[PDB]
Design a binder for this molecule. Sequence first.
Ligand code: HEM
Ligand code: HEM
Ligand SMILES: Cc1cc(N)nc(CCc2cc(CCN3CCN(C)CC3)cc(F)c2F)c1
Ligand SMILES: Cc1cc(N)nc(CCc2cc(CCN3CCN(C)CC3)cc(F)c2F)c1
Ligand SMILES: C[C@H](O)[C@H](O)[C@H]1CNc2nc(N)[nH]c(=O)c2N1
Ligand SMILES: C[C@H](O)[C@H](O)[C@H]1CNc2nc(N)[nH]c(=O)c2N1
Ligand SMILES: [Cl-]
Ligand SMILES: [Cl-]
Ligand SMILES: [Gd]
Ligand SMILES: [Gd]
Ligand SMILES: [Gd]
Ligand SMILES: [Zn+2]
Lengths: 401, 401
Amino acid sequence: FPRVKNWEVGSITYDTLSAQAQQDGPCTPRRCLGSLVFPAPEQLLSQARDFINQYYSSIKRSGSQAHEQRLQEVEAEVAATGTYQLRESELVFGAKQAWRNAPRCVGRIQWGKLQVFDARDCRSAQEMFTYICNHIKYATNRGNLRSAITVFPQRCPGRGDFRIWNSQLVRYAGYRQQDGSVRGDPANVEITELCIQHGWTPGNGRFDVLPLLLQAPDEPPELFLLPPELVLEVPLEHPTLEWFAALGLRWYALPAVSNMLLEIGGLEFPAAPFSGWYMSTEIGTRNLCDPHRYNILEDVAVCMDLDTRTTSSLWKDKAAVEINVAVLHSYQLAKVTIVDHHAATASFMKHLENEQKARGGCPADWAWIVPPISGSLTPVFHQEMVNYFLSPAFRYQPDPW
Amino acid sequence: KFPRVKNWEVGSITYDTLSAQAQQDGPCTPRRCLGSLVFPPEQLLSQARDFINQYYSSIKRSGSQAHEQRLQEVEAEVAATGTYQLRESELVFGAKQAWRNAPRCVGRIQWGKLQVFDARDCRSAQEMFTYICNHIKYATNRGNLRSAITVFPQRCPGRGDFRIWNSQLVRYAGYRQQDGSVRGDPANVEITELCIQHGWTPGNGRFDVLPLLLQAPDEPPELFLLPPELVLEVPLEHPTLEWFAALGLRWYALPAVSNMLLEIGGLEFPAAPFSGWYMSTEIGTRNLCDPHRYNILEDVAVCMDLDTRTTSSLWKDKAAVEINVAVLHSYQLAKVTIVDHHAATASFMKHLENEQKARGGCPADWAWIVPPISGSLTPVFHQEMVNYFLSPAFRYQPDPW
Ligand code: HEM
Ligand code: HEM
Ligand SMILES: Cc1cc(N)nc(CCc2cc(CCN3CCN(C)CC3)cc(F)c2F)c1
Ligand SMILES: Cc1cc(N)nc(CCc2cc(CCN3CCN(C)CC3)cc(F)c2F)c1
Ligand SMILES: C[C@H](O)[C@H](O)[C@H]1CNc2nc(N)[nH]c(=O)c2N1
Ligand SMILES: C[C@H](O)[C@H](O)[C@H]1CNc2nc(N)[nH]c(=O)c2N1
Ligand SMILES: [Cl-]
Ligand SMILES: [Cl-]
Ligand SMILES: [Gd]
Ligand SMILES: [Gd]
Ligand SMILES: [Gd]
Ligand SMILES: [Zn+2]
């Protein structure tokens, strides 16, 4: 059992939950690959069996009538159909567990508070679209954001997958330019080109909300424009730098990841978008300051009259902090839920403590948990962490194109 | 079997073929990543052989007369004595390689430029102190710092170790109070109480340079007052925050680590202090702003009239950046070599590309390479890295008590 130390406080725990880590990560005793971004009925049975065990442990019914009955039910379903179906309460529990198990999520103190929309009866991309609109509407909640997941039909033999081709429900277009540059968000050039290829009439702004490309089983993806009133946005301004507003910067309220695969008991839901609310660094540091994203850092620094010709002025660090301030101020001014990196890491520390008492540990990816600015100012920097894969889980999956 | 390594900023891909040589198993398994953890007879011949091979291949003299002949000499030396002595050029080579192989060192672009003082003819702490003093003065060089290592005699059975008890050659004292809390550096309370135990009279200050505890083999440690004119310190002032000087903050010029064991070709050097120059975040972010270190962050923010009542003002971030500005400014004004985290990480990327061409990869500990402020503002943040143990190496070792 790995000993885990907190270096700010000196406290020591042992991550006993790691001994249950099912699927294998990328590291070996020879070499650590922790920094990498991307790391048969009987086996379906044993995964299902383990998850059912988890579920019945959660409802304090381990080794009971209902429990063995369910185990029995699932085996007979797998023998008769090659798969099985989650009860609604198992689906809700499985989606919360997937979030709880997600090692790169710093927002996991909230894991128990997740609204699960069961769209497993979804019949078409049109119906998929309506479920998504209602997810966006519920989660956004006029800026008082609520965490939600909508679970579309599971992967099953004989039919294709439901897929949302967009990486998030709300994403800004990235248009390749006349001089090789990108207008808008360079992370989204690929999905943008797919949208245009699929009949979308592009804009040419920097913050053009993308249409959804929604794929029903064994179907070409179908284009759907999001009702503009469903997409809550936040114009960005800085509390004391009034020129900042003339940047014309915006971000959207709702972070809704739509390209990940939800795995529960060996069942796979390739389409199960989930949303919570932003941590400000995601927007202010990564989305706005990454050189390969909007890349506003130097322009903000020039505007702040910082000395950008020497690194030792820390012009980057100063301009980045003010961009993060602008994000936090703007979302608070718009009354859109947002959490700064200090509050978020502070709640994650309570999560680790809750999880140590609850499960004997907590799978966490230090490199993703530590925020991208002010790392060692947050308490997670000084927390050793054990990274491992537990199921139920959100998994990456290939792009359907 | 050759890890794909991606840079997520430019999109470039390398394969770390050097990882295949990893000797000492690290702490990670396919089951769980422990990458964020701080602290994870004739077998001497197999390491010696490989090291002698490294030396001669590095000088294009593999499979040659001197190579074959040196192989016999070490073979014969171990045969008669059970160990061997490094040739001067080999010791130089091994020290440079151990630095080059240090995965947590961001300044390895400098690995080729290292002054190696050979102290293998040493005995008694008085000789150690002279060697240490020659090192400090050469390394300090009136602020024009020069990388240097002093290699005291190797370990051999029966004979007690040469050990410097201090973690660094320059450390500030840490004093408990009528309330248990620490005056000075809480990182050195242990060695502060040990020096005090060995007949040192404590000061009253927050920046008392500790005395050295030098351990001759099988002899008890011996206190030594460092000559005050040999300990170059930098008073901390801020370029535009006039009141910063009045905080009385100081840091010393020379980061000289004196607790790590140098391993070269199977030989172990428990006393081998190495020094270079500071990266500004080491002082300004970790030493001054860690909560378990000088913990000055709030004091500076109060002086800046920042809103410490809400985390989302990012007062912590703003205060930290100005402390880092004051470190860089103060060292540059004192004309003491220092490097900001942008310059250091940029050079490290250059180092990675060099090592890719030279050796097919580079052991790098992502969590230690990425600086503790403005992580994603540096290129190393977006660079995937592979971490593994190569020899020769700097290794941690137990405290000699
Ligand atoms: C409610 C507030 C939430 C906060 C503050 C939050 C915070 C974060 C942050 C900052 C990341 C880093 C991702 C990146 O840098 O791209 C992340 C990742 C992640 N979050 Fe959370 N999140 C929240 C809600 C949720 C919800 C509701 C779910 C699932 C139901 C979830 C599941 C995940 C997963 C799977 C990742 C992994 C990212 C990846 O591997 O690409 N999060 N979260
Ligand atoms: C010349 C300028 C140098 C710079 C700018 C530099 C920078 C750094 C930094 C920032 C760290 C992080 C460690 C921490 O935060 O505690 C580090 C670690 C390290 N450095 Fe360098 N360093 C330099 C010279 C050297 C030299 C000359 C050697 C050996 C001959 C060396 C060997 C190491 C080792 C072994 C570590 C690992 C520290 C540990 O594991 O605790 N460095 N360096
Ligand atoms: C629900 C939620 C809350 C919140 N606060 N933020 C987010 C966005 C972060 C996020 C991003 C992703 C995409 C990951 N990238 C990695 C780099 N690769 C090149 C492209 C894909 C997946 C998430 F699962 C995820 F959560 C989501
Ligand atoms: C040569 C050089 C250049 C430079 N820029 N910085 C340094 C200091 C970094 C450094 C720090 C350490 C100690 C790290 N932890 C160990 C546990 N302890 C409780 C807290 C501090 C060991 C090094 F071997 C080492 F190198 C050295
Ligand atoms: C190479 C490195 O793994 C990559 O830049 C990671 C580092 N940590 C991260 N952490 C978060 N939260 N999000 C990210 O996208 C990344 N990117
Ligand atoms: C727990 C975590 O690994 C620990 O705080 C590490 C993180 N990264 C670090 N990086 C450097 N350069 N120095 C450190 O002391 C640490 N501490
Ligand atoms: Cl995002
Ligand atoms: Cl230090
Ligand atoms: Gd203003
Ligand atoms: Gd402009
Ligand atoms: Gd004042
Ligand atoms: Zn690992």
